[PDB]
Design a protein around this ligand. Structure first.
Ligand SMILES: [Mg+2]
Length: 801
RNA sequence: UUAUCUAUAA
């Protein structure tokens, strides 16, 4: 129900000077006065509400507001530094924008900043005081810029193509820490739609240099693709803003709507004819479809050539792989560069001269908060083979030179299925690919003996299943099927569907480009995946170098939900460790309500995993460590309540007497906390990021509760994101050190690479499982749940790697 | 689909 208090502060690891993008706030101990606004109409967007309030204050300066500078959240909440002269009697006013709005205002409450001050000093926090402050800090930026969630953006020019742009901006949030309010400031970038004529948008989306080419009506594929892009976007009439709900199938010349004549009789009129009569405009592109806008009942159709994409619309739909890359490149920058850009932003913002921030007596320090971090020692990684070598991670990285798998699978029989045309992937490549792959495999401790028992070409996803059917029936003890692919193909989804859910055969895909040109590291990394799919153990944590939680049987869980890019379900995935290393993880997966973050059927999934744990280890875990992927800030209270109880329920419906301690940990990567090295000698790599294993549980952390930051990974590009961990529940009474080290060591058990990853393997695996479930669904609730279900032989292994 | 990190999420 309520999160546990911080048990202690960590002492493990060597100290390191850090700077966080948290700026200390000096806040008065006054009382803010909270007024409620009811504006009619009641569903105008926040910007309209803000200008209504802006004009309202200036208009009623004489008798109401005077010299005061109130702040406003854009909805119903308005705050003042000192009380307005109306006591508590509601007041009805009328505001005029260039049209009329009835605005009532009644005093509702006071917000004590003193109540916050001591909430920051024991007294185990008022969310409403934090919200009031938040409204003060972001009142001026809300008028000045384009707000998006907790961020602000403006147009600077930076195209991603396909009618999209990169706008730069910043995140802003007011955050509690011990003995201070903090202002979290980070630079940000996000995708926006270009403000352009829809015609040009059609060109960029359909790759037209000129609308003049394509002088004919769109194909069906052209049309609906254009539909998916513009659908839901707002357009404006050059001639009034509208919401596009659909694109017509018919061209403007033949698309019709019911038009009532003066006789009262309605007749079907074409869009082209209507615009010719009513607006005296002859359509230049009548062969193109129309935009359906507003309520569908209204039959409102707009020609493309009279519409512009409305400025300031953030792109939410998934970017193409190239759009993503261009965005990554344009936004990525080293830790020092980011640290400087934040500084510039602080100078530029200049919060101390902000009238509203001044009005409420607030002050913001221009220096980044100094924080002492602790670089935890990494675990040793025990390999096997003849050598039994131990790897010592350096900078969150290690390798397999002169090392062999803990338990390497001795592969004897295996097949190859190449879906690339031999025109590009001749038998030359396959046999050299095989030769190089085996030498690396020999060295890896997972030796592939003998040439592949089977190697054929094939094409089309239509041929996967029968080809796979053939293989399992004709080759005894067939261990692996190496599939080769061209590029992005639906064959992949089919290969995984048949392989994971139907026949239960281990399949390893690889692209044609990688087939042609093989490097040892790429091959070695490919062997990492292959070995675990066949039930091998690449490596394990050094058993003696483990936290004491492993003293008694324990299961490690990872949970996450992947959401669709309407009417498609979200997919919940929960993985569970099946041994004491811990290496092997069993997956559970559930389809559920569209965009529901809460794992509905979690109790059944935990039950299932506890059974499998017992079946694998003959032990019932005395402790359940639950790493839950990040959740929306309101949803924390919702998630904790349903899912913590679901976990308890699983234990009880298993046995009345079964009651293991649960540790519920939310792991967040989606925040804007950035940590920088104070001393340049501590910078790692070209990106100059903090070293792997850096842990912060002081200064910027929660005043009462048990949370910490842990940057477990090496920062390769841009600025690192230290994963935030928040313990919402802990029966096991973990110390700070043991939990932090446990978490850090679990980040070294990720089998797809010999590096410490940014989150613990369980959480990462959960994401892989949920993501793999999408591909299983590519081909009605009963059917979907079934299509997601994995083959029971496959369920043993980590097929998702 | 070798892999981590990385910016979003009328
Ligand atoms: Mg998630």
């Amino acid at each position: 129900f309520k999160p546990p208090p911080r048990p202690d502060f960590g002492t493990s690891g060597r100290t390191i000077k850090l700077q966080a993008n948290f700026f200390e706030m000096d806040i008065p101990k006054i009382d803010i006065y909270h007024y409620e606004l009811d504006i009619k109409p009641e569903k105008c967007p926040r910007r309209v509400n803000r200008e209504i309030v802006e004009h309202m204050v200036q208009h009623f300066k004489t008798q109401i507001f005077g010299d005061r500078k109130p702040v406003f959240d854009g909805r119903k909440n308005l705050y003042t530094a000192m009380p307005l002269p109306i006591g508590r009697d509601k007041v009805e006013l009328e505001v005029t924008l260039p049209r009329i709005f009835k605005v009532s205002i009644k005093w509702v409450s006071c917000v004590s900043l003193q109540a916050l001050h001591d909430a920051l000093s024991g007294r185990l926090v008022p969310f409403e005081t934090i919200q009031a402050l938040d409204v003060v800090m972001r009142h001026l930026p809300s008028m000045r810029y384009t707000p998006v969630g907790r961020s602000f953006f403006t147009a600077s020019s930076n195209p991603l193509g396909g009618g999209r742009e990169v706008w730069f901006g910043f995140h802003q949030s007011v955050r509690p820490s011990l003995w201070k309010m903090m202002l979290n400031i980070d630079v940000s970038a996000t995708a926006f739609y270009k403000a352009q004529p829809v015609i040009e948008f059609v060109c960029e989306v359909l790759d037209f240099k000129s609308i003049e080419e394509q002088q004919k009506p769109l194909t069906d594929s052209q049309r609906v693709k254009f539909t998916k892009e513009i659908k839901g976007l707002k357009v404006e009439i050059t001639h009034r803003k509208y919401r596009v709900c659909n694109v017509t199938r018919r061209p403007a010349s033949h698309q019709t709507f019911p038009l009532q004549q003066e006789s009262g009789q309605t007749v079907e009129c074409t869009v082209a004819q209507y615009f010719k009569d009513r607006h005296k405009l002859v359509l230049r592109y009548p062969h193109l479809p129309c935009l359906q806008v507003g309520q569908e009942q209204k039959h409102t159709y707009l020609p493309l050539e009279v519409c512009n994409i409305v400025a300031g619309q953030r792109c939410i739909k998934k970017l193409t792989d190239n759009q993503t890359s261009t965005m990554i490149r344009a936004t990525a920058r080293s830790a020092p560069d980011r640290q400087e850009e934040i500084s510039k932003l602080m100078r530029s913002a200049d919060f101390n001269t902000d009238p509203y921030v001044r009005e409420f007596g607030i002050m913001v320090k221009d220096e980044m908060t100094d924080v002492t971090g602790r670089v935890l020692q990494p675990p040793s990684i025990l390999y096997g083979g003849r050598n039994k070598a131990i790897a010592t991670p350096v900078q969150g990285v290690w390798d397999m030179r002169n090392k062999q798998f803990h338990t390497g699978i001795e592969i004897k029989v295996w097949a190859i299925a190449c879906f690339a045309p031999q025109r590009q992937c001749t038998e030359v490549h396959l046999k050299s690919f095989t030769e190089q792959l085996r030498k690396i495999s020999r060295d890896a401790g997972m030796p592939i003996q003998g040439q592949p028992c089977f190697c054929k070409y094939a094409q089309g996803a239509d041929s996967v299943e029968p080809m796979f059917r053939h293989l399992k029936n004709t080759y005894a003890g067939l261990q692996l099927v190496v599939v080769i692919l061209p590029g992005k193909t639906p064959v992949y989804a089919e290969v995984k569907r048949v392989g994971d859910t139907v026949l239960g055969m281990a399949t390893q895909c690889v692209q044609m480009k990688n087939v042609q040109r093989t490097t040892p590291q790429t091959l070695s990394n490919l062997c990492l995946k292959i070995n675990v799919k066949l039930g091998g153990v690449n490596n394990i944590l050094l058993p003696q170098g483990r936290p004491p939680v492993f003293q008694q049987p324990v299961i490690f869980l990872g949970a996450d939900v992947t959401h669709p890019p309407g009417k498609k379900p979200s997919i919940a995935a929960v993985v569970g460790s099946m041994d004491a290393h811990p290496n092997r993880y069993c997956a559970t997966v559930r389809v559920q309500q569209h965009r529901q973050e809460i794992i509905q059927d979690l109790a059944a999934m935990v039950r299932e995993l506890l059974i499998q744990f017992y079946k694998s280890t003959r032990f019932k875990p005395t402790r359940i460590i639950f790493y839950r992927d990040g959740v929306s800030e309101g949803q924390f209270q919702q998630v904790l309540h349903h899912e913590l109880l679901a976990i308890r329920e699983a234990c009880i419906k298993l046995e009345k007497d079964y009651q293991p301690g649960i540790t519920f940990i939310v792991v967040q990567k989606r925040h804007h906390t950035r940590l920088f090295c104070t001393d340049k000698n501590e910078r790692v790599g070209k990106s100059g990021n903090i070293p792997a294993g850096t842990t912060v549980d002081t200064k910027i952390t929660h005043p009462t509760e048990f949370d910490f930051y842990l940057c477990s990974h090496a920062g390769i590009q841009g600025t690192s994101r230290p994963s935030h961990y928040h313990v919402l529940w802990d029966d096991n009474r973990f110390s700070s050190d043991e939990l932090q080290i446990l978490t850090y060591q679990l980040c070294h058990t990720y089998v797809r690479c010999t590096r410490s990853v940014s989150i613990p393997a369980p959480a990462y695996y959960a994401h892989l499982v949920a993501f793999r479930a999408r591909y299983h669904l590519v081909d009605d609730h009963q059917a979907l749940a079934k299509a997601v279900q994995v083959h029971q032989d496959t369920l043993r292994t980590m097929y998702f790697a």
